[PDB]
């Protein structure tokens, strides 16, 4: 199966690459990823920029090489064996008509099915940058795949050296529902189950936490009593401080 682990180097390369090649809005940057993917856990362990150009006449007419792919994987192999190519890279502008159409060409020199990592590697979006997709036709049919990170023991320690709640999640929740409604209205208009049906009745009854509140309450007294002992304890420590001050004053008066 699938369960995808993604190098922080992948995200950071894609970022740096887009500015450094002077790639604007209304030009794509396309790439390759390789690692190990013949396993239940797809390991993305490296990646590389691919030469990509798109024409004035129609911008779903485009050029990707395959020779930069022929001999570059056989330089990837030579530092770390097991870092052949299984798929591909995108920075956006996202979800175009010919963003389907790199799939049939990338099927020519992959060993399973092109894995499509679109990533918002300008880091401009809000939330996830990773718009991961298994590249399946049928058109831009595009089942998404959830999973970023897992990296090496050395890299994570290095990451931390570089860098050195309920509401935020609720606001996200509100925005999805609000978006979902807007879509449903649009969808009726254009046209002229179960997941939605569990997302209404189930939550109707902090909402869920209500039913639970009965059980919570009993333990809730107990954990409250525990905080009260701690308050007494702070008072006890306090009394010593008052004495310390009291002593000093007393010595100053003798003297």
């Amino acid at each position: 199966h699938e369960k995808v682990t993604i190098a922080p180097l992948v995200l950071l390369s894609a970022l740096d690459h887009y500015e450094r090649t002077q790639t604007k809005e209304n030009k794509r940057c396309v790439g390759v990823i390789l690692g190990d993917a013949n396993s239940s856990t797809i390991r993305v362990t490296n990646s590389f920029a691919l030469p990509f150009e798109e024409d004035e006449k129609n911008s779903d007419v485009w050029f990707l090489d395959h020779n930069y792919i022929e001999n570059m994987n056989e330089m990837c192999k030579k530092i770390n064996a097991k870092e052949k190519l299984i798929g591909w890279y995108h920075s956006g502008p996202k979800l175009r008509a010919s963003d389907l159409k790199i799939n049939e060409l990338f099927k020519k020199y992959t060993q399973n099915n092109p894995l499509l990592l679109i990533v918002d590697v300008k880091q401009q979006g809000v939330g996830l940058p990773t718009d991961a997709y298994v590249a399946i036709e049928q058109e831009k049919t595009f089942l998404h795949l959830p999973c970023t990170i897992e990296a090496e023991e050395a890299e994570e320690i290095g990451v931390e050296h570089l860098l050195r709640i309920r509401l935020t999640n609720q606001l996200k929740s509100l925005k999805g529902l609000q978006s979902k409604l807007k879509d449903v209205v649009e969808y009726l208009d254009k046209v002229i189950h179960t997941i939605l049906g569990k997302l209404q009745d189930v939550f109707n009854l902090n909402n869920l936490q209500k039913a639970l509140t009965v059980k919570t309450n009993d333990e809730l007294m107990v954990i409250y009593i525990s905080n009260l002992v701690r308050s007494i304890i702070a008072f006890d420590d306090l009394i010593e401080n008052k004495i310390q001050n009291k002593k000093i004053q007393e010595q100053r008066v003798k003297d």
């Binding site: 950071l12 880091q123 996830l128 970023t148």
Partner: peptide
């Protein structure tokens, strides 16, 4: 020393 851009710095902290 280190040098890194703001773009990296923002979009690490929505993963970590």
């Amino acid at each position: 020393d280190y040098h890194k851009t703001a773009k990296e710095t923002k979009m690490l902290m929505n993963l970590h």
